[PDB]
Amino acid sequence: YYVDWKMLRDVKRRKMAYEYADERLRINSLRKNTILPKDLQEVADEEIASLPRDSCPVRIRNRCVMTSRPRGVKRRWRLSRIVFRHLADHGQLSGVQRAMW
Amino acid sequence: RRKALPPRTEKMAVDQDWPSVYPVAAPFKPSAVPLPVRMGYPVKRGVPMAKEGNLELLKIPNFLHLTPVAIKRHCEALKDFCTEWPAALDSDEKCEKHFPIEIDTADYVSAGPSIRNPKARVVTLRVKLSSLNLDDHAKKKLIKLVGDRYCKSTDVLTIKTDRCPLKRQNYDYAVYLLTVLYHESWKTEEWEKK
Amino acid sequence: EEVVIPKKKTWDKVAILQALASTVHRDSTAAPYVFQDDPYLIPTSSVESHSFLLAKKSGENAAKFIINSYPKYFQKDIAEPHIPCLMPEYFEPQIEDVSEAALQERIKLXXXXXXXXXXXXXXXXXXXXXXXXXXXXXXXXXXTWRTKNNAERIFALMPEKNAH
Amino acid sequence: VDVPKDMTKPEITISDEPDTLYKRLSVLVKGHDKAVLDSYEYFAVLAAKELGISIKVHEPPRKIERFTLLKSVHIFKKHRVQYEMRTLYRCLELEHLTGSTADVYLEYIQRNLPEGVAMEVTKTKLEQLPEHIRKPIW
Amino acid sequence: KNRAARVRVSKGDKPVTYEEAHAPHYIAHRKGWLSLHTGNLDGEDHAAERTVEDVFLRKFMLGTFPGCLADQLVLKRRANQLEICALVLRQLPPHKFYFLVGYSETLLSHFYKCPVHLHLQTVPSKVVYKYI
Amino acid sequence: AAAAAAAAAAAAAAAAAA
Amino acid sequence: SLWDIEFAKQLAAVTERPFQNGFEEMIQWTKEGKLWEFPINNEAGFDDDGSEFHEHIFLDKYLQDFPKQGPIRHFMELVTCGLSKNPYLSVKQKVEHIEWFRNYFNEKRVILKESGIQLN
Amino acid sequence: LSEYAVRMSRLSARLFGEVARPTDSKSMKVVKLFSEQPLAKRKETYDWYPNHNTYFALMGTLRFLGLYRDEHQDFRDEQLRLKKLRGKGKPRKGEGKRA
Ligand SMILES: [Mg+2]
Ligand SMILES: [Mg+2]
């Protein structure tokens, strides 16, 4: 079990987005190019908008990995701010400490 | 049935060679260390906590396997593997007069399951231009050809090679690049007269 | 001419580790390295040494059992150099109905080997000189009437070269 | 009293090849707490003096990374908690080394790297000239 | 009032470990880090991985040795191997302790695909820093 | 405008580059 | 030969003691492959199919079949140049990209001819 | 700017293996696209989560094999037992609403 249904959704999304990365890239090559004619690019356009909607990366969310919180995340530990503090304050995060200066 | 055995510190001879006890990196068992050591913050009347059951000493990386006697011994065992450094090379001048080409290579060690570090690929090639056989024309043409990779004050040419998966591949590509720069600096062409 | 180069010394991987083990002799006041070093878990007698070490091995075994019982949990790999030694093990036959695979497969694994050779002899599949040379090495390594029966099938069906 | 007899069996071979020369070898140790880096420095220097490796040691400026999070679960934005991570450095700069010596010294040093520290090894190696460049011209 | 990772003052009878008696603002000042690994240093990678690994280890160990864990775990990571070091109450017979040592070390070695060492330090009763 | 001929193949085979 | 294997096992059984030291633990572990090799080289374990830098940098060979003067040369020389700078991919994979383009352009001849440039 | 300079530059690109022929600002993106690792392919992305199924499943089994001891699951259990005893349980599927 992932902690939340939402997290589940996200796992799927990352899987699909991993699978179609090659197709998406190859097509958006054509799409993003001035050199090729527009007639290729409109077909290529429908091509990439044909692809399953959950395969596109912008639909991914970086979520807290233990607690599933959608924001207030620190990218480095993939941790919610709350869970991060909870680990660091027991000193289970090496080299992390309160800051005085 | 409750068993309590006295610590090794009892049976410990005073002059017993220490590296015998901690040959390798070790957690610091308090039972196997003779020295009384109190660490921890004290309490108002009290002292620093004892070495037994002390969690704070357990956190400390201990240099106990590395006590200087153990190093002397270790190194003396390693003297057999090492090979000598050539006499005449003692000064940098002769280094350059003999070996013109410096290849810089990075290697990274970090703790964890995987060895793989992205940064390891990069190979840097530094070469003085004064150590090259270049013509006047060829030298000017090379300088213009490479551009920013050439330092005009120190005359040290720099080739940073990245693009390939392996450091050996990148080494080959930097050397190749150098070769080609030298070969194509000496070729005069039509438009060079323009 | 003034330029002088020495040669390179190629040593085995573990070599430096062994040359370091050479300046360390064995410790007197120390219990055996295998056991835990604390006074409570240090073996007092010979019987305790035995029961302790045997216990540790029974634990190790329990673990390996769990792994090989549910391999999918241990599939996901992290380690970069990829140790093959920490992978779960596969004791199932890789093909079911095909004889020439299932025979050798279930032989490498003793009774399932014979179930396999029986399912190959039931389909009129010819068992060659290597087949029951392996099933024979399995009758020697695993296993008085069944020895006579298996020997009879070894000679009668296939005319096996003696050397096996 | 009890001494094992004939305890040593090292295995070393000499290939005919021209072992690689290292003009300079830099070793950068990052760690969290200073003291460990000092002990490590002591050990490293000692280990090099015994192999006759002739090294210098200097200390690169410390980097402190700070950042902020909210102090409360829900809503008081006015209150925060700030965390640090301090990275401290030592630099071991070795000069005029050989290939084998480098591999040994580095093996020994790297094995004994304490757990809270990291290490970066910059080897500048000496090569004379490539073949096709020597003195041909195309 | 800050509450984080604090053990509040009771009527004055409460036994408190050296660890528990020090609020987060004392980390790196008086008490040290319960883990050590390269990941949180300036130029380094995979901090996240090691954090999750850590969390799972504390949970796992706490469940594998029920009731006998004295203080929170110590996790040292060195050049691809993890040495776990624990303070353990004497509860079990050494049979059960060695069984669990071996079982654990093998299990976790196959889980995390790296050599795992386990070091047990045994203690009569929870070491007491304060009150009591 | 101008398209100049650079020989990939010649310098390739010569410098071990192909 | 199963008997030779059981012989090597019976020999290795008398040969194998429970470890007498840490250095032994590390030695057996290293030979086993569990421990790391020292001094560390991060490229250990991965040679990348024994390829050499010219099977990486120069992709001209796979552009042999493609219209030589067209805008397709422009586009494909860009794709090519991109793959030339790409560390994370193998040779095989780059070539698979190239071929996907071969196949996709050769899939649509129609749109290319109609486009105002005759394209091969 | 001269013709000499442009010939030189063309030679520089061709040599170092960068883009040979003159391109738009807009088209260079293509090169960028193949120079890099596409976002959904990075280990920071598809590998982001730990597999929670493996952790939950494995530690569940190890609980049933009596190696691991889960006090949380135990708490959940005992609470639930006491709840079915008091008479409020979980309705068998399909039964609750209409009945
Ligand atoms: Mg919920
Ligand atoms: Mg978003």
mmCIF file of N, CA and C and ligand atoms in Angstrom, chain A residues 58-61, ligand 2:
data_model
loop_
_atom_site.group_PDB
_atom_site.id
_atom_site.type_symbol
_atom_site.label_atom_id
_atom_site.label_comp_id
_atom_site.label_asym_id
_atom_site.label_seq_id
_atom_site.Cartn_x
_atom_site.Cartn_y
_atom_site.Cartn_z
ATOM 1 N N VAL A 58 4.325 16.843 -17.064
ATOM 2 C CA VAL A 58 3.793 17.939 -16.260
ATOM 3 C C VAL A 58 2.704 17.502 -15.286
ATOM 4 N N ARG A 59 2.139 16.322 -15.527
ATOM 5 C CA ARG A 59 1.091 15.772 -14.680
ATOM 6 C C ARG A 59 1.635 15.056 -13.449
ATOM 7 N N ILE A 60 2.951 15.053 -13.292
ATOM 8 C CA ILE A 60 3.588 14.418 -12.144
ATOM 9 C C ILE A 60 3.648 15.384 -10.979
ATOM 10 N N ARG A 61 3.507 14.864 -9.771
ATOM 11 C CA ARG A 61 3.714 15.677 -8.592
ATOM 12 C C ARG A 61 4.784 15.045 -7.706
HETATM 13 MG MG MG I 2 3.670 20.319 -11.155
#
